[PDB]
Amino acid sequence: HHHTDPMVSKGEELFTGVVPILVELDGDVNGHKFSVSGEGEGDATYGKLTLKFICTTGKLPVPWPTLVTTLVLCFSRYPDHMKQHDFFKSAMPEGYVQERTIFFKDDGNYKTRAEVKFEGDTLVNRIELKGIDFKEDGNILGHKLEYNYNSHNVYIMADKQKNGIKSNFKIRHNIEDGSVQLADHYQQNTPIGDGPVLLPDNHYLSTQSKLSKDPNEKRDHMVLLEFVTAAGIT
């Protein structure tokens, strides 16, 4: 609402209230083609997301928790003293590309590319996902993961050469038998536009996610509440 840096003001202004979100994913995992649509709202003031996702092609062929990181970090809450480090909002409204490779230990990998940008007043995240080399009897295609999600801190670093950011981090998915399925993420983000962006000092994001079901919904779906806060600069 009041920042002495006009570049920060420009990005904050687009995220000042509740912003509607649309998520589209087209996926192919070991030749099972599927699509997911999601709708909800983001409130960057509190770092809060609320989304509901539907598999529009029938039953989702992989477990919903494996898609949480893939299915909008511009809604992170950056403390006032860290707002000059917020790459994600500084790239708006033209947006950014978010690319990942996700390696599931002892199993296959996801390769994702997403464009995150405004269409009018709506923040859209449009994703293509390709998954290969998964085991039919593994934890992913065998749906052995529990329907829950662990809190996680992720380290963000600038990539000055690409005018973007980079991160590598591990997600632990609980398996029904009490064990864990590791998912190693590599991520890079680059701006879509050619204007300047804020390139951050090293810092981390703290995330927490809660998964639930809509008791009146017959389609395969996931309801997601996420909180993300930046930290690590004193």
Swiss-Prot record:
Outcome recorded upon mutating residue 72 to L: In EYFP; leads to yellow fluorescence, folds faster and more efficiently at 37 degrees Celsius and has superior solubility and brightness
GO biological process, one term: generation of precursor metabolites and energy
Protein name: Green fluorescent protein
Effect of residue 149 to C: In mut1.9; shifts fluorescence lifetime from 3.03 to 2.74 ns
Effect of residue 151 to P: Increases fluorescence at warmer temperatures such as 37 degrees Celsius
Keyword list, A-Z: Chromophore, Luminescence, Photoprotein
Effect of residue 207 to H/W/F: Results in significantly red-shifted excitation and emission maxima
Recorded family membership: Belongs to the GFP family.
Subunit structure: Monomer.
SUPFAM superfamilies listed in its UniProt record: GFP-like (SSF54511)
Effect of residue 76 to A: Increases fluorescence at warmer temperatures such as 37 degrees Celsius. In GFPmut 3; highly fluorescent mutant when excited at 488 nm
Gene: GFP
UniProt-listed Pfam families: GFP
Practical applications according to UniProt: Green fluorescent protein has been engineered to produce a vast number of variously colored mutants, fusion proteins, and biosensors. Further generation of mutants led to more stable proteins (at 37 degrees Celsius for example) with brighter fluorescence and longer fluorescence lifetimes.
Outcome of swapping residue 132 to V: In EBFP2.0; shifts the excitation and emission spectra to shorter wavelengths and increases quantum yields compared to BFP
Mutagenesis / variant outcome for changing residue 149 to F: In Sapphire/H9-40; exhibits a huge Stoke's shift, with an excitation peak at 399 nm and an emission peak at 511 nm. In Azurite; shifts the excitation and emission spectra to shorter wavelengths and increases quantum yields compared to BFP
Impact when changing residue 84 to R: In Azurite; shifts the excitation and emission spectra to shorter wavelengths and increases quantum yields compared to BFP
Highest classification ranks of the organism: Eukaryota, Metazoa, Cnidaria, Hydrozoa, Hydroidolina
Modification note: Contains a chromophore consisting of modified amino acid residues. Maturation of the chromophore requires nothing other than molecular oxygen.
Free-text function comment from the UniProt entry: Energy-transfer acceptor. Its role is to transduce the blue chemiluminescence of the protein aequorin into green fluorescent light by energy transfer. Fluoresces in vivo upon receiving energy from the Ca(2+)-activated photoprotein aequorin.
Effect annotated for changing residue 154 to I: In Azurite; shifts the excitation and emission spectra to shorter wavelengths and increases quantum yields compared to BFP
Consequence of substituting residue 202 to I: In mut2.1; shifts fluorescence lifetime from 3.03 to 2.50 ns
Effect of residue 175 to V: In EBFP1.2; shifts the excitation and emission spectra to shorter wavelengths and increases quantum yields compared to BFP
Effect annotated for changing residue 109 to T: In EBFP1.2; shifts the excitation and emission spectra to shorter wavelengths and increases quantum yields compared to BFP
UniProt-listed InterPro entries: GFP, GFP-related, Green_fluorescent_prot
Outcome of mutating residue 157 to T: Increases fluorescence at warmer temperatures such as 37 degrees Celsius
